[PDB]
Amino acid sequence: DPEVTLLLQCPGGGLPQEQIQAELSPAHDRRPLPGGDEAITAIWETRLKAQPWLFDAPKFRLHSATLAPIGSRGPQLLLRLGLTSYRDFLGTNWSSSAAWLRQQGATDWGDTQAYLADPLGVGAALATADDFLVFLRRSRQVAEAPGLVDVPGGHPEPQDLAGQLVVHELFSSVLQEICDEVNLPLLTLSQPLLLGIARNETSAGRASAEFYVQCSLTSEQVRKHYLSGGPEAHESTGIFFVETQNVRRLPETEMWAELCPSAKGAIILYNRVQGSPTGAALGSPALLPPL
Numbered sequence: 001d002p003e004v005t006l007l008l009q010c011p012g013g014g015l016p017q018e019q020i021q022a023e024l025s026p027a028h029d030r031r032p033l034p035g036g037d038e039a040i041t042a043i044w045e046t047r048l049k050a051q052p053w054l055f056d057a058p059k060f061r062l063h064s065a066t067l068a069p070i071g072s073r074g075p076q077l078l079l080r081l082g083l084t085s086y087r088d089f090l091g092t093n094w095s096s097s098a099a100w101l102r103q104q105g106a107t108d109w110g111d112t113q114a115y116l117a118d119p120l121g122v123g124a125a126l127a128t129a130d131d132f133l134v135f136l137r138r139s140r141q142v143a144e145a146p147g148l149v150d151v152p153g154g155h156p157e158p159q160d161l162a163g164q165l166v167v168h169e170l171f172s173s174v175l176q177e178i179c180d181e182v183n184l185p186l187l188t189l190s191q192p193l194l195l196g197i198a199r200n201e202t203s204a205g206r207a208s209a210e211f212y213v214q215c216s217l218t219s220e221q222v223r224k225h226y227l228s229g230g231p232e233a234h235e236s237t238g239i240f241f242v243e244t245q246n247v248r249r250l251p252e253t254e255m256w257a258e259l260c261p262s263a264k265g266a267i268i269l270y271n272r273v274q275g276s277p278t279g280a281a282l283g284s285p286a287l288l289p290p291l
């Protein structure tokens with residue numbers, strides 16, 4: 001699967017909010033383009049003069065993420081975060097020249113991402129009380145990944161001593177994206193666990209944090225909540241469900257070629273971190289069928 005690379009696989013079946021530190025520093029920002037950020041400004045002007053109702057928004061930037069030694073006490077993960085914008089994204093990762101920017105970053109900084117916006121995404125492997133994962137069908141009219149299968153998520157807009165508020169906003173934002181798009185009540189959702197971080201190689205290597213969230217509703221009840229908002233309540237064009245039993249082999253199905261890079265990251269991390277049992281009982285042949 002060349003379109004997705006794993007940056008991080010969390011231990012312990014996934015990390016809760018209380019085990020994660022962030023460092024939000026301008027040292028973690030994108031570097032100015034070699035010939036100047038006027039190139040980004042020019043692309044933005046062209047876009048606004050065609051679509052004047054567009055607006056900029058701030059985004060978090062992922063610089064790097066360092067896991068503690070496994071088995072340790074205290075904080076288990078440090079996220080090194082900067083700030084970027086939707087404008088900077090459109091001028092870098094989304095640009096036809098994004099591969100040239102990666103090569104220049106390797107040359108100048110020994111960092112393929114140094115000249116890229118790399119806005120941080122969030123997504124969920126969202127499980128039902130009757131053991132299905134939730135999938136969404138993207139509109140064929142949107143700019144990114146038209147017509148492909150996705151999971152719930154997005155690219156959060158901002159607002160350890162400012163760090164803990166940043167970790168709180170990231171965990172809050174994946175629940176808010178589930179409430180906004182799937183139309184579920186907040187009180188039906190578990191506190192999220194971070195499964196890991198995945199890079200989207202079709203979008204010049206931008207990274208997304210992928211979470212596991214449990215819902216106390218059945219698949220039939222989730223479908224009812226999604227549909228009862230009507231066409232204007234969601235950006236997706238449909239909802240569907242796959243048994244957790246069958247997610248195990250999803251990369252061998254015809255569905256795999258329809259999943260956008262976001263969703264593929266979330267399913268690989270769910271299979272490695274929540275699936276793949278380690279103990280004698282769940283690892284027995286009747287419960288973990290060979291092949």
Ligand SMILES: N#CCC(=O)NCc1ccncc1
Pocket residue numbers: 059085086089094119143144155
């Ligand atoms: N920031 C960020 C990510 C993002 O906006 N995703 C896809 C996209 C949306 C609108 N136009 C082009 C591409």
Ligand SMILES: N#CCC(=O)NCc1ccncc1
Pocket residue numbers: 121122123124144145150151152153154155200208209260261262263266
């Ligand atoms: N490519 C693509 C679509 C996209 O970015 N969907 C939102 C998203 C879903 C899961 N993880 C992170 C972000």
